[PDB]
Design a protein around this ligand. Structure first.
Ligand SMILES: COC(=O)C1=C(CN2CC(F)(F)C[C@H]2C(=O)O)NC(c2nccs2)=N[C@H]1c1ccc(F)cc1Cl
Ligand SMILES: COC(=O)C1=C(CN2CC(F)(F)C[C@H]2C(=O)O)NC(c2nccs2)=N[C@H]1c1ccc(F)cc1Cl
Ligand SMILES: COC(=O)C1=C(CN2CC(F)(F)C[C@H]2C(=O)O)NC(c2nccs2)=N[C@H]1c1ccc(F)cc1Cl
Ligand SMILES: COC(=O)C1=C(CN2CC(F)(F)C[C@H]2C(=O)O)NC(c2nccs2)=N[C@H]1c1ccc(F)cc1Cl
Ligand SMILES: COC(=O)C1=C(CN2CC(F)(F)C[C@H]2C(=O)O)NC(c2nccs2)=N[C@H]1c1ccc(F)cc1Cl
Ligand SMILES: COC(=O)C1=C(CN2CC(F)(F)C[C@H]2C(=O)O)NC(c2nccs2)=N[C@H]1c1ccc(F)cc1Cl
Ligand SMILES: [Cl-]
Ligand SMILES: [Cl-]
Ligand SMILES: [Cl-]
Lengths: 150, 142, 150, 142, 142, 142
């Protein structure tokens, strides 16, 4: 079975990989943000939306991963070979969940197409040589003849 | 945050806990069953249903957990540091995912009501003394 | 004072004793079952029914007994007198509470009249020589309303 | 399960805790009093009331507890260990049943509303400095 | 800034000081009483009244003070300085909070005017020579 | 009793905790600001608002806490014991009161809804990687 967690939400793992790790908040900051904005919906008996359902699982899975990793770290041989487990989370599964949690939280806040446009805008900005690009990053929340039809 | 994965699906962790561990298929057998019955839906770009959305994540999370567990296990050469890891998976996170995967797969197949009534029927059957109970278990499809 | 806990429910200690100890689930399994079927009612501010009131007290009383028995067991030095306390619970008060808890839970589920007729049916079945009786026990659910104002 | 015996009767464990231990009659005196006032109703085939149902179980439970404690207590040899059981009963489960038995007996006699306001009245009287408070306690019946 | 906690409630620190220390219940007994009478209002999302708001902060401030005093007491080497910390709380901030907690709880129960007249009534009674005064204190609820 | 000081003001301790410690002005700077903006109201015999009532108690509670801390500090001879007491308030109760004083002062100035939206705005901004976020923080007065 080849399941892409982003496919049902109009994205792909390959698209989220266009963003380097430095772009994403930490998991703990993503989790704290999910609580501050969406705790009541996330804890409710109502589906709310597919992003809500998915985000619920991602949060619980991270708990699963940390419980197992902590149990491994609390009973493994060298209290120096924990730096390896911590590093393995940071270099591998940590970035995956930063991508995933950021994706659902930001989609719930700004909508999929704003999220997907910002994904490419920032991924292009950060690949432009710093001496040739605008000093500040593009901004996620951003975006006459209104008078004619008054 | 205290999230119960079953709450949006009309159940609770405690209700699933009413079923003994011996009740559930293995994770591998649940995953192969999800593929045989629902692969095309699980792999499609359509949400399909909230159970589909949840099951997609549960399957992927298991991969995450096993990747971590195997990588830890393949870099241990003491089988007292190795069989312990397998035992921890079997007794702890393995049982959680057997409950979760069975719940979503069976709900997709039979409906929540049927699943919730069978949870109670079987949990009560198995707690009845074997000499006083029907020799065969109740049947989910009915 | 001579109080029979079953008398207000149209039964008697003697009638409940017609079932052998082998018939009843364990206390733990009756407690799990009461929670699985009736947790919300048992925890509510509503009486619900005399069976609910009784089952509430029975559950808490068992807690009292286990607390006392555990405190006694933690202050006994002989590890064979600790097993004697365990045996005293199982042979004496344990059977009493298995009878009582089963009675109230089954009555809430199937009704008093079904419960009492099953009591007699199973009690007669188990007393029939195994070579002369049906190979399987009778079944509670196969047997074929006061509002309690106050 | 978290069951509060007083909740279905419009009270709580913590509310009964507002009264000091010295406020309650002894278990024996409560048992004598239930017998003197309500023996016939308690022994009848009529439910009579939720308080009757509860009090029936509380009385029998105390019997269960005393049988166990007596069976334990009659099998020790050190008279400082025997008294240790007596102290543990008095400090713990004895106070719980004094609270419970008084509550149901007093409710049957005076009504829940009178009982609850007396719990508050006496609880406040006993917490007032003795040199500042009325020389006699408040009275349940009035 | 010179803030008197009683000023917005029609009283003053000097007026509460007219009652001797022995008049007031202990902080523990005031906290238990606030819970018994007003727990639901105090914990509710509704302001309810300025007394509710003030009492909410007073309770939490006492928690803060006890946390600090406990942390200080557990890190003092000299166990005679620890008892000194205990004495300083009882003689100083403990008395201030007995005044404050009593004031808000009694105002919620009997109203401001009854409380303030009782303050003067008891303050005058206790300053009358015991051989010349009525044997019993005046009564707040009358 | 479980009282959240923000609940009657439409917030919770958890929501205020979303802001890191370095977001908040110092207690002294908050107290100076309360004096410069609201001294006459805080000292007046009028309730003014629940925020006024709450802020009045918070200021006096900090006074209580500092009086206790100063009395302890003036009776410690070791200047490293005094620095630890100073450090403990800053790490602990100081942060609680910085949160509290800021919340009431900013609510009186800008309104609850602006304050709550700003807590989330700044809380999200500071969790965005500095190389990916706007160089300047969002502005409370918008
Ligand atoms: C809700 O309780 C029940 O449904 C019971 C049935 C439900 N039955 C369980 C079954 F035996 F498996 C068949 C089924 C039925 O009656 O159809 N049978 C019996 C008994 N039969 C013989 C001795 S006890 N007892 C209760 C019961 C069982 C297990 C438990 F943990 C708690 C309870 Cl209250
Ligand atoms: C779609 O899955 C099923 O149909 C299930 C059946 C279908 N039943 C299988 C059967 F037990 F063989 C009879 C049949 C039925 O209900 O008719 N029974 C049970 C359970 N029954 C008792 C404990 S679990 N669980 C699921 C299931 C079984 C195996 C598996 F690998 C994955 C799943 Cl989701
Ligand atoms: C709810 O508070 C009260 O009812 C008060 C009474 C009610 N009275 C208690 C009584 F003294 F017993 C008589 C009764 C009354 O006024 O009728 N009297 C007094 C005081 N009287 C003298 C000094 S303090 N204070 C309060 C009170 C008492 C105890 C406590 F723990 C907390 C409080 Cl707020
Ligand atoms: C039958 O119940 C009663 O009438 C009670 C009275 C009623 N009367 C007792 C009295 F104290 F003598 C006055 C009188 C009344 O209220 O008029 N007072 C009190 C209490 N008062 C203070 C602490 S407990 N408790 C119950 C009671 C008393 C003794 C006993 F063994 C069992 C019970 Cl349930
Ligand atoms: C609710 O989530 C957000 O509003 C996000 C913003 C909101 N923006 C934060 C800001 F950078 F400060 C500006 C603001 C805006 O878009 O106006 N920006 C970004 C990112 N920008 C660049 C890289 S990630 N990601 C999310 C976010 C940020 C922090 C966090 F802990 C969790 C999340 Cl989901
Ligand atoms: C009256 O209080 C204020 O106006 C506040 C401003 C007003 N702003 C101060 C400014 F940052 F300088 C710009 C201005 C504005 O919002 O327009 N900003 C902020 C904060 N912003 C980020 C973290 S705290 N907090 C309060 C405040 C500031 C200092 C102080 F001593 C006490 C208080 Cl209550
Ligand atoms: Cl009888
Ligand atoms: Cl004096
Ligand atoms: Cl609470």
């Amino acid at each position: 079975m080849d399941i892409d967690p982003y496919k049902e939400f109009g994205a792909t793992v390959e698209l989220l990989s266009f963003l380097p790790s430095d772009f994403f908040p930490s998991v703990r900051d993503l989790l704290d943000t999910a609580a501050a904005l969406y705790r009541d919906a996330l804890e409710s008996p109502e589906h709310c939306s597919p992003h809500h359902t998915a985000l619920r699982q991602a949060i619980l899975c991270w708990g699963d991963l940390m419980t197992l990793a902590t149990w491994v770290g609390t009973n493994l041989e060298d209290p120096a070979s924990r730096d390896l487990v911590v590093s393995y989370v940071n270099t591998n599964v940590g970035l995956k969940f930063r991508q995933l949690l950021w994706f659902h939280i930001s989609c719930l806040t700004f909508g999929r197409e704003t999220v997907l446009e910002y994904l490419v805008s920032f991924g292009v900005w950060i690949r432009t040589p710093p001496a040739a690009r605008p000093p500040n990053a593009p901004i996620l929340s951003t975006l006459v003849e209104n008078l004619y039809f008054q």
